[PDB]
Amino acid sequence: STGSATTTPIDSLDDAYITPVQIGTPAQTLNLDFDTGSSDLWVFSSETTASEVDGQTIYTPSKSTTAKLLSGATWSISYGDGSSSSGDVYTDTVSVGGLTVTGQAVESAKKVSSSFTEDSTIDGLLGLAFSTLNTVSPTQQKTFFDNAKASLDSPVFTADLGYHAPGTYNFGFIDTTAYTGSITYTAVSTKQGFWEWTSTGYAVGSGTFKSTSIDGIADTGTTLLYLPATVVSAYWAQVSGAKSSSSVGGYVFPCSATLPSFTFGVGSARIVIPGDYIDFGPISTGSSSCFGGIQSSAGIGINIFGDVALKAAFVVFNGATTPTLGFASK
């Protein structure tokens, strides 16, 4: 089997991407944030505290003839951005782009933090990291991909995120028309439960490539590119007037600037992030200070190849017995 679904930016800045997901019978379609940096499929629901719902579409398990309470199971998650959610668990039928999993754990939110409530466009998350990170207790549950894997034509999914435009998540096949040149594959460590890999270096604009190993995670659920302070400083030093602002929470730059590109290495291959991808716009409405899309990972504890990086590539998440990551230009 295969599946193919379009993923759409939630706003004009590509802050996140939502993908429609069919849950239950008859189908209830929710727009979920596919997140390769976590492993829980959770939804706003009829059980979510009413004051914490503000415009989201909810899953109502009582209206699904295939929903079953997973007795005694609870979940609770905290994300890198400080947000969180928790609740109980149902199993139900879940389909993405024509690919159906029966018996999928659908984690129903009883509580969500303010950031989730305030984002009316995201109805929940669909985790695509390794199932070892799944938070369901006392019986850990598998991700949608893990459940689907054996039925897929090939044990892979791909992320093809758009810049200010829709893109595609495919399951079970590699669309050879969706990228240019060849896909370069690179080793993955699953030790921390992430799609963790080592970039071979970077360049800023038309500058020379610096060969240096940068361990990080491919994370579709994070907006920005978080890299070591040395690398980030080298980037922003090429933008007149750019500075790190503790009050704002990172590097800002004059909105009048033209940003240089940023290149990262994948083996001997190179992925180029155009300068415009690194512009996250005014820090507040009407400001001439703009927020940068490359930020320091210092004090996160891990480097994160988030959407800013991934949207410059066609990315293969290869879930074979020994997982690997593939990157192609597009």
From Swiss-Prot:
Disulfide bonds join 255-290. Keywords: Aspartyl protease, Disulfide bond, Hydrolase, Protease, Signal, Zymogen. It comes from the Eukaryota. GO terms for biological process: proteolysis. GO terms for molecular function: aspartic-type endopeptidase activity. The active site is at residues 35, 199. It catalyses: Hydrolysis of proteins with specificity similar to that of pepsin A, prefers hydrophobic residues at P1 and P1', but does not cleave 14-Ala-|-Leu-15 in the B chain of insulin or Z-Glu-Tyr. Clots milk. Residues 17-328 form the Peptidase A1 domain. Its EC number is 3.4.23.22. Belongs to the peptidase A1 family. This is Endothiapepsin.
